[PDB]
Design a protein around this ligand. Structure first.
Ligand SMILES: [Mg+2]
Ligand SMILES: [Mg+2]
Ligand SMILES: [Mg+2]
Ligand SMILES: [Mg+2]
Ligand SMILES: [Mg+2]
Ligand SMILES: [Mg+2]
Ligand SMILES: [Mg+2]
Ligand SMILES: [Mg+2]
Ligand SMILES: [Mg+2]
Ligand SMILES: [Mg+2]
Ligand SMILES: [Mg+2]
Ligand SMILES: [Mg+2]
Ligand SMILES: [Mg+2]
Ligand SMILES: [Mg+2]
Lengths: 58, 117, 141, 106, 55, 143, 78, 145
RNA sequence: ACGGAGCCAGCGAGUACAACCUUGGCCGAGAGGUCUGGGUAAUCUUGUGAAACUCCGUCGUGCUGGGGAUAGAGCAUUGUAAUUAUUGCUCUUCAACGAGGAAUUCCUAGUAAGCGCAAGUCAUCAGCUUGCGUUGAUUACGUCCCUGCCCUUUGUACACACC
């Protein structure tokens, strides 16, 4: 949207923190280890590094 | 000199509409009324008038007692007897003609006077 | 084109950019005659390089200095540095090495920061006090 | 027929630097191997974003304070360029972290 | 709990108009750049936010 | 033999141009003058009981001559220093806008200023020449 | 605290013709002249100290050496 | 520059508005000595009176004194604005008076006992002789008499 | 001190699912309101034309034009709601105060001190606080005497350790 660049960057950072705390909360039993957020013009992919990959996959 | 408000003598004061008071009554209350008032003081004044008319014309009308403190003393409510809440008890107060302009909370001393020794 | 060089001088924030050309003794800072710097007491300071060397040294030269930033004394010192640096740069570039040599000797021989920039610069204020190296006060009781 | 010069304008953004710098390097290398006219990768004052907080959560202790920050770099660029090659350049060579925006200068 | 009396009071503004979004606290809140989070929650999550101690 | 306003010392130039406006009957003076503080900062009027308006106009015209274009708010910030806020630490408070607006309107009425396209006021040709003449005369009076 | 100064007017608020005679023949024999000195001789209150001193610059009785404000420094015609 | 001062004409002690003033002070600040008269007010009154700013309180003539006092007691006729006054409106009669010294104490007092009679918090506090403007008093004042 | 006049900064921040920074043109003495603007940001506020300071005047040793608390009245502004005075502005009132006992704090160069400005809080509110810059020094460039600290040696009935 029409949002200042600094505000948008802070929003992206707090969204990163969003996901990080989310995954720590839920995926812990499945061995969550880290998160990354990569963005293309098309889609915003979230790459989830975990110990037990299949259980996260389900 | 009995009393006059701004050259509006007490006799003239006795029954003036609030809108007439608006042109008098310096900037604070002026801004208040200009910026609407609320629903509640309508009910307060209605209750006051009801107690005024119902009383048998010889005694000070029955205690109209309420928690609404921000209300302000307008001409067509002189003579009523209001219990203005205090945080403990509705402090009783009659409405002298000089009460006008000020607040109802003014006569509800929110704290007992402090004394040492 | 007219032989002309541009220099700068600084004082903690204040920047004086001087452009010197082959002119007729034209000396304007902010488009005003140099005689009218407001400090009025730091006034001699804006003259200060010239009197060291003698204004005859620049009779075929014109100097215009645009200056920004700083306070007032900082502004004046930046103007001084700009003037001196412009003289040195022009004389070195177009006149002769020895000419620049006596100019540098005369400038450095008096108030060394007249030619060289001052590095003396404020440092951040730490917390716990009104100044970078001050503390509020203590009670003890 | 899309021969009209577009005056396309790019603006980058990055919390960090090296990704932004190599992205700009890639954009300029693509433009130059495509024979485009460019106004160079201008450098803008990296806006520092500072927050000073009290370390202690309770206020007890000697007054001690800290200053977190980022330093954002924008560094817009601009081309006098046609569409398809340039729009394809815009949609390629993006790494994470660096955010890119495009305005057509229509 | 009258539908027009329960939670009647406005909250367009003031201290309680906004929450920590991490703990829902009111005290020690930061509103700069829209963080809307409190002192110390910021104190540890800032590194993942992108903040780092420099000076 | 050429000269400009930037070529003349300031303070004496402002007072000279103020006196020239004083002797001339132009520059109509609003009625509410001689009572206003010219700034919320001020608590005593101008010490000059009459004619301070002319000096203010001189300063304003000189200032517009110096800059590209200026509005009333720029003057308001420029004029006026610090309150003695009783016990409060001083801050800056902007001067009175009525004085600056009336000064600008009067200058427009005289014709030394015109409303710039960019938004604000700027100096016209004839007024600029007027200030040039005043500058040359002040320099001559100096020597 | 207590007004123990015991100070009278210690100056002159409105001049005398005799006071004008004093100041007129007084410019000689005082080689240093300043508003401070003129008040110091009990003869000028100080509000009119500058007034009188400027008046002395009517026939060039006392030439200026530095005419800055906050003071006034002059020396007799010699 | 200076004048011969016209000995035999400079007033020393004046009695204006049944209050005594000293003639050696500048006229504006001299008039400030009267209660209910400030420096700004006295200055505007003086300049409305055409009497010079740089005069002394002993050098003005008697007709000038009469002009000054009639100005100072009836401002509204003399294009002194409806504001600027000591007691604008006067919450009794709605006409903008400007109280002078003795009238000033009389009226301020009568307002104080009106507030006492009104029995407002302002009134009760004024009766108590504490801080009435709602300031902190836990550590302030602590000592008057 | 008060009038005028001169007219220099640097850190910031700023409206979105809403309503910020506000230029300019209006009007009003003022706070202010008003209509159009620009600005999601080296673009506009902004060159934040800030203060101290600079120059010319007035005042003149007077608790005085120092000092501005405490006090009446008015005009507005944020707010559902300002009374127990939010804040601003206008007038008037002008108090206490004479360089501050024993004590005690901080400080060695862009330093202390003066001077403000931006940001946090914020709807409205700072005397706070972080940072920023400006005007910018006196005096050391040393010693364990007071208050402590390092380590070594020594003595101890101490080990909750000279409280
Ligand atoms: Mg300091
Ligand atoms: Mg000024
Ligand atoms: Mg002061
Ligand atoms: Mg004073
Ligand atoms: Mg001044
Ligand atoms: Mg700058
Ligand atoms: Mg300023
Ligand atoms: Mg006094
Ligand atoms: Mg000070
Ligand atoms: Mg606090
Ligand atoms: Mg040492
Ligand atoms: Mg100690
Ligand atoms: Mg033991
Ligand atoms: Mg013992």
């Amino acid at each position: 949207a029409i949002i200042s660049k600094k505000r948008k960057l802070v929003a992206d950072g707090v969204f990163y923190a969003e996901l990080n705390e989310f995954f720590t909360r839920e995926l812990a039993e499945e061995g969550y280890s880290g998160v990354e957020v990569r963005v293309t013009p098309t889609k915003t992919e979230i790459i989830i590094r975990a110990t037990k990959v299949q259980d996260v996959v389900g | 000199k009995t009393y006059s408000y701004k050259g509006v003598d007490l006799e003239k004061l006795l029954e003036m509409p609030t809108e007439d008071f608006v042109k008098l009554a310096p900037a604070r209350v002026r801004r208040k009324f200009a910026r609407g008032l609320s629903e509640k003081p309508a009910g307060l004044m209605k209750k006051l008038r009801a107690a005024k008319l119902s009383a048998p014309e010889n005694e000070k009308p029955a205690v109209v007692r309420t928690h609404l403190r921000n209300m302000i003393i307008v001409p067509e409510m002189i003579g009523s007897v209001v219990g203005v809440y205090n945080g403990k008890v509705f402090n009783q107060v009659e409405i002298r003609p000089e009460m006008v302009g000020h607040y109802l909370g003014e006569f509800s001393i929110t704290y007992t006077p402090v004394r040492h020794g | 084109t007219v032989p002309s060089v541009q220099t700068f001088g600084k004082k903690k924030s204040a920047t004086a950019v001087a452009h010197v050309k082959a002119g007729k003794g034209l000396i304007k800072v902010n488009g005003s005659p140099i005689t009218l710097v407001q400090p009025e007491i730091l006034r001699f300071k804006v003259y200060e390089p010239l009197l060291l060397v003698g204004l005859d040294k620049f009779a075929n030269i014109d100097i215009r200095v645009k200056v920004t930033g700083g306070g007032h004394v900082s502004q004046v010192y930046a103007i001084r540095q700009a003037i001196a640096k412009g003289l040195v740069a022009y004389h070195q570039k177009f006149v002769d090495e020895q000419s620049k040599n006596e100019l540098k000797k005369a400038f450095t021989s008096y108030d060394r920061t007249l030619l060289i920039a001052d590095s003396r610069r404020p440092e951040p204020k730490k917390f716990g006090g009104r100044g970078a190296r001050s503390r509020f006060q203590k009670s003890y009781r | 027929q899309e021969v009209v010069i577009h005056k396309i304008r790019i603006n980058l953004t990055s919390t960090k630097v090296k990704q932004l710098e190599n992205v700009s390097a890639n954009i300029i290398k693509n433009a130059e191997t495509f024979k485009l006219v460019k106004k160079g990768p201008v450098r803008l004052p990296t806006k520092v974003l500072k927050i000073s907080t009290r370390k202690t959560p309770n206020g007890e202790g000697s007054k001690t304070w800290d200053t977190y920050e980022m330093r954002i770099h924008k560094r817009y660029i601009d081309l006098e360029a046609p569409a398809h090659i340039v729009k394809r350049i815009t949609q390629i060579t993006i790494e994470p972290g660096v955010d890119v925006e495009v305005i057509i200068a229509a | 709990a009258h539908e027009n009396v329960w939670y009647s009071h406005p909250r367009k503004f003031g201290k309680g108009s906004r929450q920590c979004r991490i703990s829902g606290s009111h005290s020690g809140l930061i509103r700069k750049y829209g963080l809307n989070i409190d002192r110390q929650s910021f104190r540890e999550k800032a590194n993942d936010i992108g903040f780092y101690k420099y000076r | 033999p050429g000269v400009s306003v930037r070529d003349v010392p300031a303070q004496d130039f402002i007072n000279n141009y103020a006196s020239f406006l004083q002797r001339q009957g132009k520059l109509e003076v609003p009625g509410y003058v001689d009572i206003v503080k010219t700034s919320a900062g001020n608590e005593l009027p101008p010490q000059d009981s009459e004619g301070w308006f002319y000096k203010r106009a001189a300063s304003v015209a000189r200032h517009i001559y110096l800059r590209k274009q200026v509005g009333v708010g720029k003057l308001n910030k420029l004029y006026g220093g610090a309150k003695n806020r009783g016990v409060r630490p001083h801050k800056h408070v902007d001067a009175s806008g009525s004085i600056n607006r009336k000064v600008l309107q009067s200058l427009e009425k005289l014709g030394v200023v015109e409303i710039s396209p960019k938004g604000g006021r700027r100096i016209s040709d004839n007024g600029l020449r007027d200030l040039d003449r005043i500058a040359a005369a002040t320099l001559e009076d100096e020597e | 605290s207590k007004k123990s100064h015991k100070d009278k007017a210690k100056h002159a608020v409105v001049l005398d013709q005799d006071k004008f005679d004093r100041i007129m023949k007084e410019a000689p024999t005082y080689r240093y002249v300043s508003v401070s000195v003129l008040v110091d001789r009990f003869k000028l209150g100080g509000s009119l100290a500058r007034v009188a001193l400027r008046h002395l610059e009517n026939e060039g009785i006392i030439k200026p050496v530095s005419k800055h404000s906050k003071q006034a420094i002059y020396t007799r015609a010699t | 520059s200076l004048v011969v001062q016209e000995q035999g004409s400079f007033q020393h002690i004046l009695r204006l508005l049944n209050t005594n003033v000293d003639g050696n002070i500048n006229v504006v600040y001299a008039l400030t000595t009267i209660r209910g008269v400030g420096r700004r007010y006295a200055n505007l009154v003086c300049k409305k009176a055409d009497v010079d700013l740089h005069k002394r309180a002993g050098e003005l003539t008697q007709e000038e004194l009469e002009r000054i006092v009639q100005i100072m007691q009836n401002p509204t006729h003399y294009k002194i604005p409806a504001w600027f006054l000591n007691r604008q409106k006067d919450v009794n009669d709605g006409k903008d008076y400007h109280s002078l010294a003795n009238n000033l104490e009389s009226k301020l007092r009568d307002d104080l006992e009106r507030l006492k009679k009104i029995r407002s918090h302002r009134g009760i506090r004024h009766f108590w002789g504490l801080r009435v403007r709602g300031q902190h008093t836990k550590t302030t004042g602590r000592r008057r008499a």
